[PDB]
Amino acid sequence: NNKRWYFTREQLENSPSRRFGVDPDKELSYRQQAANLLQDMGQRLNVSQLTINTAIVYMHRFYMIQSFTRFPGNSVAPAALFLAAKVEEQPKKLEHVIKVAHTCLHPQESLPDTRSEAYLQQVQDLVILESIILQTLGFELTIDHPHTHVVKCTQLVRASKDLAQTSYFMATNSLHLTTFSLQYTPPVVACVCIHLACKWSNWEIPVSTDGKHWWEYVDATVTLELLDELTHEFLQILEKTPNRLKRIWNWRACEA
Template structure:
């Protein structure tokens, strides 16, 4: 982590001042590429996990289990939907760079929820997330947290941040759903029902 210059840091700014404008443009182009989180079907079938011998179907199952944990734990902690959605996005982005064989999914999910809480200004203590995790998992699943679950999550937090390149802002569709719903005229109950259905589809 120390060997990589963080975009926007003091050392990065000083380096920019000493380089030519051409190099600056190249770096800007590189950053845009680094922050592109959209993938085509070919890339989705060549993830680190799949290249590590995990089948496409099993990887999807692991992703679903991690996302489900974030939602279940977050709802028990009464976190907002945007916080939960942010945690799920972090989780999926992380595993586009790393393998499930290397990083246990439930530890990563707990870490992503912890990080999302801070990013969305709805912070929860790490120990409280771990306490909820213990109630949602069997002994075998919780054993992946090791002897010191809190330290395991906090250590992984640094790796997650580096992996997602400190790109913490995630734009969700919820605000657009509400805005569009306000544009409709007619039966309020039907509009509310339609909004709820769209909200459910978004969560799925």
């Protein structure tokens, strides 16, 4: 999906920011961070999770071709979130996602204005950034974040209120932490996010009718061994990110 956005490490560390003067150590902090206002400055205009992830790849992949060394990242979200929030059924205005920005961005600075010198180059650059983004993202409109199946595997397999309830949450975090966006397809990235529930509670969901593994539904190539490796990797960003890690450090304190 579509196998153009998924390349080996050849283009992982080859990213514009991974060679245009930004140490790899300074990328999963740049992404996340700017991906933290997405889930907040976005999580405001009743933005569905739908609208939050679309813009979570509308930055990851956008900066995939672009750079931070010449683009307002924190103020690029309006760009990723202009097409994102607009693409999804509930689009918005030129200010709605740019006024609260001043909230989330400038939590102290004075009020903004439509007449003020501000709101001009904001509705200049940002308004034009929309031009500057789609064309790198080939004008596409197809993005199925690894969820739809995770939200589809629950029932038919008959999960519970603590495993399937734990399912929603692993996909998202893989959108605000790991680079599985432009490396692993949404399905394969689902068996892992579903895996971190039973790889937690040890709820090894029994085989299928004919001794078939549950990770064969979200994809036909999802293998245990590889899948094992893909969740462990998730134990890489969580292991050190001292911000959200503590969230899941205790967020599992209220299902049972």
